[PDB]
Amino acid sequence: TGAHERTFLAVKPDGVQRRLVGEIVRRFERKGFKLVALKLVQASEELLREHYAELRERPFYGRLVKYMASGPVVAMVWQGLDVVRTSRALIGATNPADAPPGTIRGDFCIEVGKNLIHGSDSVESARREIALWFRADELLCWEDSAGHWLYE
Amino acid sequence: TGAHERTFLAVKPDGVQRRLVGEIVRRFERKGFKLVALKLVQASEELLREHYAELRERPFYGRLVKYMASGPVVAMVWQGLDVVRTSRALIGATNPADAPPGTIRGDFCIEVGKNLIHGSDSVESARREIALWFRADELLCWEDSAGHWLYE
Amino acid sequence: TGAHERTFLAVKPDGVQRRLVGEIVRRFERKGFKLVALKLVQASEELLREHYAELRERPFYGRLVKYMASGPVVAMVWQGLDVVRTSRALIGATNPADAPPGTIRGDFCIEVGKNLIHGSDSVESARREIALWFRADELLCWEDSAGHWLYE
Amino acid sequence: TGAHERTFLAVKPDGVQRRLVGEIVRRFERKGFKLVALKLVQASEELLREHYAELRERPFYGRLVKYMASGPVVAMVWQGLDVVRTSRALIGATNPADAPPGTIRGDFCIEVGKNLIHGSDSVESARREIALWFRADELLCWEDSAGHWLYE
Amino acid sequence: TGAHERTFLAVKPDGVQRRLVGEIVRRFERKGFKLVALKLVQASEELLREHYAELRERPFYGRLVKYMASGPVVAMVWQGLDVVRTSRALIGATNPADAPPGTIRGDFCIEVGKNLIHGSDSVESARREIALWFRADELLCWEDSAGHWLYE
Amino acid sequence: TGAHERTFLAVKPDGVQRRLVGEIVRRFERKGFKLVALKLVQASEELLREHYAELRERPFYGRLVKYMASGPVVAMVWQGLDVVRTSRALIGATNPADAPPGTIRGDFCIEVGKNLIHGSDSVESARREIALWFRADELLCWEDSAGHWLYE
Ligand SMILES: Nc1ncnc2c1ncn2[C@@H]1O[C@H](COP(=O)(O)OP(=O)(O)O)[C@@H](O)[C@H]1O
Ligand SMILES: Nc1ncnc2c1ncn2[C@@H]1O[C@H](COP(=O)(O)OP(=O)(O)O)[C@@H](O)[C@H]1O
Ligand SMILES: Nc1ncnc2c1ncn2[C@@H]1O[C@H](COP(=O)(O)OP(=O)(O)O)[C@@H](O)[C@H]1O
Ligand SMILES: Nc1ncnc2c1ncn2[C@@H]1O[C@H](COP(=O)(O)OP(=O)(O)O)[C@@H](O)[C@H]1O
Ligand SMILES: Nc1ncnc2c1ncn2[C@@H]1O[C@H](COP(=O)(O)OP(=O)(O)O)[C@@H](O)[C@H]1O
Ligand SMILES: Nc1ncnc2c1ncn2[C@@H]1O[C@H](COP(=O)(O)OP(=O)(O)O)[C@@H](O)[C@H]1O
Ligand SMILES: [Mg+2]
Ligand SMILES: [Mg+2]
Ligand SMILES: [Mg+2]
Ligand SMILES: [Mg+2]
Ligand SMILES: [Mg+2]
Ligand SMILES: [Mg+2]
């Protein structure tokens, strides 16, 4: 897919509550990525248990699911070259204490449980997460007039 | 409704294309308003013709509808005291040439046909537009921890 | 006093709680005014009752005093030409609904009771307020290297 | 000329010294205007005396000319619909004390002699000033990919 | 102390003179740390010689003390989990040439002697510096309504 | 030359088209570097072939030259201690995928061909590039009043 690669990002409840949705979106916009889906949702525990299926054996799993179900999240899909890996780099390490200044977590967060945002960790994860959170008809193709200035 | 008043805002295609979605959202966030719904959509001509029903006899109606249907828009609902009138003030006059610096249109736009954003013009318009664009289950009630610092 | 005019500003508890101290300070810094005093304090009811002596007959007086005593404020003195009147303009109208975008209240606030900041309303008020909140030895004289580029 | 209208702007020495060149340029860029010329120069007294010929009888003329010749200025030409009048609005009133917050002078200046920037006051003034400061071969025609999103 | 850990920061004279006090405070605010003390002061040589006691053998010690005593500084205490180590990371390396973009020194400074800010290098250093610069009654306890969104 | 070291930077056509000229200039301004030359130009292929002489055997050379000649660039000279190496660090790695957040390319770009800006790679390169792009009389000496706060 190359430049058509996509990732799933979600602003977590702490990001909404601390009024950082615009700030986060703006960082992906200024980087050059293309927004292809967006909605504010209250995720069910059922969806979240599937979202985090791979973490089912971790001791924080129960609390992570409860937390993510506790308030609104902003679900998003972004498109562009290497968007999965690059998004992860813009977000910064899982634990904000390891995330350098300049990253979202490095600039805005302190603790692993309140780290503002989720990003898919691979192309395959993004495929799964996009399908889980969004119908095909919520993913928009639009002609991106900036593309000429971001890509050869 | 008082502090529960709501308005409908939409970032128009020019706002998406020029990468101002985050910028716009951030201005409503920093003002203190509560985001209660959000989605990126491709609006149909049918929806837009009803959205702009009051302008049906004006000669720009056709091209307004075509333009708004020509690319993705970011549909939003914001909640708070006097949110309809205050949102209109943050956005600025219809014609950007009359919108002072500090407003969205005053800072970011030049011409009336490319003026970035729609806001409801009254509480009754907001009522109609919210129902037209969003189901009840897309409008989220969340406990706003900032509310104590915005309201008495 | 001319360019030596001074005003008293205070970031109110809502400004501290919403993390807008730096934002506010930065607006006075970028304007060209000279910071001559600064401290984070918890104001007593006794001080606040005198600070707001002129409002003693108003129905919001009791609640205003209690609120301002309820949490830390950032007390400040700024110096420069016409600083009292210009600070009031940067802050915006008492009621944020009347404060245009570009002002502190217009950009960041909604309601008259949670309006972020106090500014002296006149040179006489500033005289009184500066004396009430700060000792002479908390007001600092420093050689301002920017002064040649702000003043003729 | 319509959307091909042009104005002459100059960041004055105080704007260079206070490091606000980027800030100012960014405000015209975000507004949608097209940059068609730009250079850092040290203007001669001869040029400045002609630039300000209409102010020759005013008491500040001598000091204005000397000051503008005392350091580098950033000379610019911007193009777009109503750019002369709109530029003046973004800049704000001559005397910064009358320039509201949101404008360049309202946000960044205090005194009439140190007011950061010059803008042409009319289409005829811009014609004269552009010719005086720039050769025809310093004014660049480029295909503006944003134009589709700023104009009908 | 965990989340009650505290560090001492000081904006040095160059930070005040270049008008970066707001900018610096804003970076600590947006990170989530809690401001518990703040004042603008002119530090004595006596205090500064003790502040920098560990550097007494170094060749820049005399000049460092003189410089820090030469103009106002903004003394601060910040509270939060791992605040001492994280503050140092937000500030960046001692020598700004080694401080990456995104850090305060990486974004705003060039030279080791003009590096904007001091931060305690350990919990014990912070304890000592807090006691040296502030009385107990200048350190404020306030109920932090954002804490729920920064900490588990 | 020490603090008199100079580098050549150029905002490439993508930086002009995406409206990031002010943003880029502002980063060099806030760092403390001194702007000593600036112009918007349309570079000839002849000049660009010499500019990029060392890359003549690389497969992108033809397309790089054509691209850089295809639209306006903003040519600049900046002065200060270690400005060549530090500029390169602020810009970030050639390939934006390797450029961390906080850098220009890390924040604003995706692909190596659309990476916003050129910076000299050494003191000798800067010497050559400055002479190639600018006459001696376009390089300005001005007294930098901020220098006392950037340098010891
Ligand atoms: N030790 C922990 N305690 C609490 N929450 C944790 C912990 N480790 C991870 N989490 C949370 O779970 C989320 C998912 O964990 P994981 O998938 O391993 O990391 P990532 O989100 O970086 O892919 C994290 O982003 C974080 O909010
Ligand atoms: N003369 C015009 N030509 C083109 N578009 C127009 C014209 N007048 C208004 N419009 C467009 O129609 C939209 C709706 O018009 P109106 O409802 O009167 O204004 P507003 O959006 O400020 O409530 C405007 O926001 C603008 O984009
Ligand atoms: N009607 C009101 N209800 C609640 N609080 C009010 C009301 N009017 C004023 N206040 C509060 O009292 C403060 C002081 O009032 P006043 O001195 O008249 O205004 P200002 O602060 O603009 O000088 C206001 O800034 C506001 O926070
Ligand atoms: N009384 C004054 N003292 C000092 N400088 C002044 C005075 N009046 C005007 N100036 C300066 O002269 C410039 C040109 O004056 P004028 O052309 O009337 O204003 P404008 O710049 O708004 O077109 C102003 O921008 C200001 O910098
Ligand atoms: N070689 C030097 N020349 C001048 N000043 C220096 C030098 N090295 C360090 N300093 C200054 O002394 C301060 C204290 O030194 P040190 O305690 O090592 O650094 P830090 O502030 O990073 O803990 C530095 O922040 C810097 O301003
Ligand atoms: N593989 C490539 N494909 C396309 N363009 C490239 C490639 N490698 C380099 N370039 C472009 O050519 C410019 C010059 O390359 P080079 O001089 O090696 O890098 P730098 O700009 O870091 O000094 C780069 O900045 C980039 O825009
Ligand atoms: Mg994960
Ligand atoms: Mg309307
Ligand atoms: Mg009052
Ligand atoms: Mg004039
Ligand atoms: Mg130290
Ligand atoms: Mg190179």
Author numbering:
A (entry chain A), B (entry chain D), C (entry chain E), D (entry chain F), E (entry chain B), F (entry chain C): 18 to 169
Study authors write:
With regard to their common enzymatic activity, NDPKs are NTP/NDP transphosphorylases encoded by the nme genes. They catalyze the transfer of the γ-phosphate group from an NTP to an NDP via the formation of a high-energy intermediate on a catalytic histidine residue. We produced a truncated version of human NDPK isoform C (residues Thr18–Glu169, NDPK-C hereafter) and determined the 3D structure via X-ray crystallography in the absence and presence of various nucleotides. A data analysis revealed a hexameric arrangement, which is organized as three dimers, as previously reported for other functional eukaryotic NDPK variants.
Crystals of NDPK-C in a complex with ADP grew in two different conditions: (1) in a metal chelating screening solution containing citrate (see the Methods section), we obtained crystals without the magnesium ion; and (2) under non-chelating crystallization conditions, a magnesium ion was detected in the active site. The magnesium-containing crystals (belonging to space group C2) diffracted to a resolution of 2.10 Å. Essentially, we detected a very similar mode of nucleotide binding including the residues described above for the metal ion free form (Phe77, Val129, Asn132, Lys29, Arg105 and Thr111). Arg122 showed the same position and orientation, but its contact to the β-phosphate of ADP was lost as evidenced by a change in the distance from 2.9 to 4 Å. In addition to the residues already described (Tyr69, His135 and Gly136), Asp138 was also part of the pocket, and we observed four water molecules which localized in a square pyramidal manner around the metal ion; the fifth coordination site was occupied by an oxygen from the nucleotide α-phosphate. However, a superposition of the nucleotide-binding pockets in the absence and presence of magnesium revealed that the magnesium ion induces a change in the conformation of the phosphate groups with the consequence of a weakened connection of ADP to Arg122. Thus, the magnesium ion changed the number, localization and coordination of the water molecules as well as the conformation of the nucleotide phosphate chain. In our NDPK-C structure, we observed the same coordination of Mg2+ to three water molecules and the α- and β-phosphate of ADP. First of all, these data indicate that we crystallized an active form of human NDPK-C in complex with ADP and Mg2+ in the C2 space group. During catalysis, the Mg2+ is indispensable in stabilizing the negative charge of the leaving phosphate from ATP at the transition state.
